[PDB]
Amino acid sequence: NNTITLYDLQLESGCTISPYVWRTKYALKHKGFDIDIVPGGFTGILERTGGRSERVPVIVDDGEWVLDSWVIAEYLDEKYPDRPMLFEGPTQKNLMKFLDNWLWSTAVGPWFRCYILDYHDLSLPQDRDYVRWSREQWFLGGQRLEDVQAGREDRLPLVPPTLEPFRRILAETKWLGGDQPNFADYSALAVFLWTASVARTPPLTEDDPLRDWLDRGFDLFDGLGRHPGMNPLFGLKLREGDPEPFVRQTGP
Amino acid sequence: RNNTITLYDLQLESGCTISPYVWRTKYALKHKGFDIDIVPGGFTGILERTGGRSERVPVIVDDGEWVLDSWVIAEYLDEKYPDRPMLFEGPTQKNLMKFLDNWLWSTAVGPWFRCYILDYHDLSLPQDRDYVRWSREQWFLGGQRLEDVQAGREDRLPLVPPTLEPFRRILAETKWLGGDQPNFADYSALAVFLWTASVARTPPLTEDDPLRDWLDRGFDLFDGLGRHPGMNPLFGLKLREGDPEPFVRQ
Ligand SMILES: N[C@@H](CCC(=O)N[C@@H](CS)C(=O)NCC(=O)O)C(=O)O
Ligand SMILES: N[C@@H](CCC(=O)N[C@@H](CS)C(=O)NCC(=O)O)C(=O)O
Known about the structure:
2 copies of one chain form a homodimer.
Chain A: E1 3-7, H1 19-30, E2 34-38, H2 45-48, E3 58-61, E4 64-67, H3 69-79, H4 90-114, H5 116-121, H6 128-138, H7 145-149, H8 152-155, H9 164-170, H10 183-198, H11 210-223
Parallel strand pairs in A: 1-2
Antiparallel strand pairs in A: 1-3, 3-4
Helix pairs in contact in A: 1-3, 1-10, 4-10
Bound molecules: glutathione (GSH) (2 copies).
One glutathione binds at residues 10, 19, 21, 43, 46, 56-58, 69-71 of chain B.
PDB class: transferase
Keywords: Glutathione-S-transferase B-etherase, transferase
Assembly: dimeric
């Protein structure tokens, strides 16, 4: 106290990649905790923990271990109601997962195949082999990463328009949590925080309306999403035949 | 004023509510524990039935407070009656609700609107048919005549259920969208299906659709609020050899 251990999933730059670990970091600062970060990558997770977990994030409040970012979030609300609440209620949880799933299908799905080689290259040296064969065979490929990430210049322009349903919401609220952010924002923001960690070329345009909520979210808690290894999410340059990245409209 | 709140309805010929905005208002009102003085009527004459106060329903009249727009009504009920069960649990629900509702209207209402627009028309009040005809043809282009839009729904309807899977995924891990008890999130989502049921003269879903559990319990809420004599079964869609699989069975 006032510290909680956090088993991180970091790239070679020490920059967090896992959105599950991202929203946990955010969930902890939201609660006003200090984070004792345990650095580590994809490989050797089970050994870093006391043989307690094959996945991260994992927190160790005092001595109590807590696995799974969602459980951890629910745990922080459980044991610390005095601190700023992560969940607004049961209805947020259900509606969150709907938005979360939608962001994973719409943003993570494409961007994953657009940054999988960068994802691999930016990883710690000890992870590169593991990340190589597992990702390109299970999720999958079926062939190698260089072949999947190839042609991303053509794929990336098609993602921004599909995000419009999410732009529609943020156009009428500062945060998903209302006037202040909560786990809804951090859960959704994790998507872009992960993207920013592996995007060696920006997936969004400069003037994307998402940027307001994004820059604000990344700036939260003394720039929690402003790690040195974080790449810019904005800077995508489109062609004549590309779709409009977002609805340019105003506004009664 | 006893326990009664007046509600200007949008009814079909059978007296069954069609508008999803009115549906979620009914549910929101019953959820608050209010009795509803239903002012019947249809698409035509809304200005006349109201005090020239609105051209659109739902509209409630609490004591003397006229409240317009289903969303504003729900918030008004939460604002004025915090002692009665809440409709929203806070700002976060509202924002994520809008996202879900938007997805439901893009995924369910849109396709089903085209597939049931002639039934929609045929089921409306006789003094509304031509208006609904003239209105929906010049506006929701859709387009050609109502017949041409609904034409070939037998090919279009089987394509909708699979796209509803992202919604089933949530309901497979919760009793209601609002936890153990439903709220406006449930009612708002249910309204899409309440609207469909009021006009669907052929079932859009299969008998075994995982949504059925949440839907039936939802339609049954508040003394069968969604079980008006005019409703049609949402379930009974007969799939053919070529039709896709309507839902994940895992
Ligand atoms: N149950 C975890 C999911 C953990 C997880 O899937 N982590 C990924 C990062 S995206 C990972 O570590 N993959 C490699 C591994 O399993 O070791 C949560 O939701 O918090
Ligand atoms: N502002 C209302 C929407 C009202 C509305 O769009 N009503 C439709 C029913 S789908 C209607 O009556 N359309 C024909 C008309 O305006 O008379 C709300 O969101 O609650």
